[PDB]
Structure formats: C-alpha cells, structure tokens
Ligand binder design. Structure first.
Ligand SMILES: Cc1nc2ccccc2[nH]1
Ligand SMILES: [Cl-]
Ligand SMILES: [Cl-]
Ligand SMILES: [Cl-]
Length: 163
C-alpha cells in the first residue's frame, strides 16, 4: 500500500503515466478503439491478448510485468440512464478488486463512460463519484487522467472538498 494513500489529477496522456499500473477505458471486444483505448493500444499492444470482457467488468492482461486493467464502462447510447448507472458503478468495483489483487501501490485511472460512451451528456460528477465509491477502501495512490482544462479544475476541486 501507499504510505498515505491519496487522490491526484493530471491533465495529460494516460499512456505517459508514472504509476505501477493503468486502467484502460476498454470496449467489450478487446479492439484498439479510439481515445484512451487507442493510446493504450499503441503503448501496450501485448496487453490486448484475450482482453475481451463484458460491460461492467475488468480484466487484467500483463504487458511484460506492467499490468493493464481493461475496464468496460457502459455506452449510454445503448443503456437506459438507470441500467448504465448500475454497470458504470460495477466496472469501478471490479477495478478496485484488480488493483487490490495486483498489490500495486499506485494506479492511473481515466473517468469511464465520459467520452464516446457518454451518450452526449457531461458525466464528470457521475463517473468520478462511482470511482470514489470503489477506490476509497483501497490503499493505492490513485492518479486520475483527463484532457480538458475545465475538467482538471472540477476534478481537483472534488478531491480537495473531501480533504
Ligand atoms: C486521459 C486521456 N488519455 C488520452 C489519450 C488519447 C486521447 C484522449 C485521452 N485522455
Ligand atoms: Cl500529454
Ligand atoms: Cl468513454
Ligand atoms: Cl477530459
């Protein structure tokens, strides 16, 4: 575990993280995809061997000794708000199980279902609050990766509000 487990946010490519493992915002079929998933595929392509897994689950595949946790958030274009919310909470609970099992002291995480799976809605608060529900009981240092400057400010404020 980390000496004083923390949350941080960085505005940069998660493929350049400084943590002991990475969470991929994966698709259920293990395909290269786009956004976070394509960056992860370019950096750790070996991790996409038998990475296919259902919505609401997470599957870990090694790239050398570096773990890639493929977490499959719902596509809100396809799910009801209610069913999508349940699957999004579930995907993060499965990430917390994998981070615990791996014994890592740190993890790089994106906000699941906030990009092309958002069904065109702003889901920053929804996705972040499900990330906290899952990860609060883990002792890894969590570093949240985003692209947008306004999202960085909002995520930082949400972290700071609990401190
Ligand atoms: C956190 C993160 N990493 C990315 C890589 C490519 C595109 C969007 C991304 N967002
Ligand atoms: Cl970057
Ligand atoms: Cl997404
Ligand atoms: Cl973002």
């Amino acid at each position: 575990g980390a000496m004083a487990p923390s949350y941080r946010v960085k505005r940069m490519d998660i493929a350049k993280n400084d943590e002991e493992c990475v969470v991929n915002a994966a698709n259920p079929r293990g395909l290269p995809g786009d956004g976070v998933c394509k960056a992860v595929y370019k950096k750790w392509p070996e991790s996409f061997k038998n990475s296919a897994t259902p919505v609401g689950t997470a599957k870990t595949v090694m790239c050398g000794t570096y773990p890639v946790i493929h977490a499959v958030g719902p596509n809100f274009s396809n799910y009801t708000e209610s069913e999508g919310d349940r699957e999004l909470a579930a995907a993060y609970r499965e990430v917390a199980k994998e981070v615990t099992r791996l014994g890592v002291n740190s993890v790089a995480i994106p906000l699941l279902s906030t990009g092309v799976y958002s069904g065109g809605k702003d889901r920053l608060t929804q996705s972040l609050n499900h990330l906290f529900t899952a990860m609060d009981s883990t002792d890894a240092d969590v570093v949240i990766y985003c692209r947008d400057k306004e999202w960085e400010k909002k995520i930082s404020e949400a972290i700071q509000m609990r401190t």
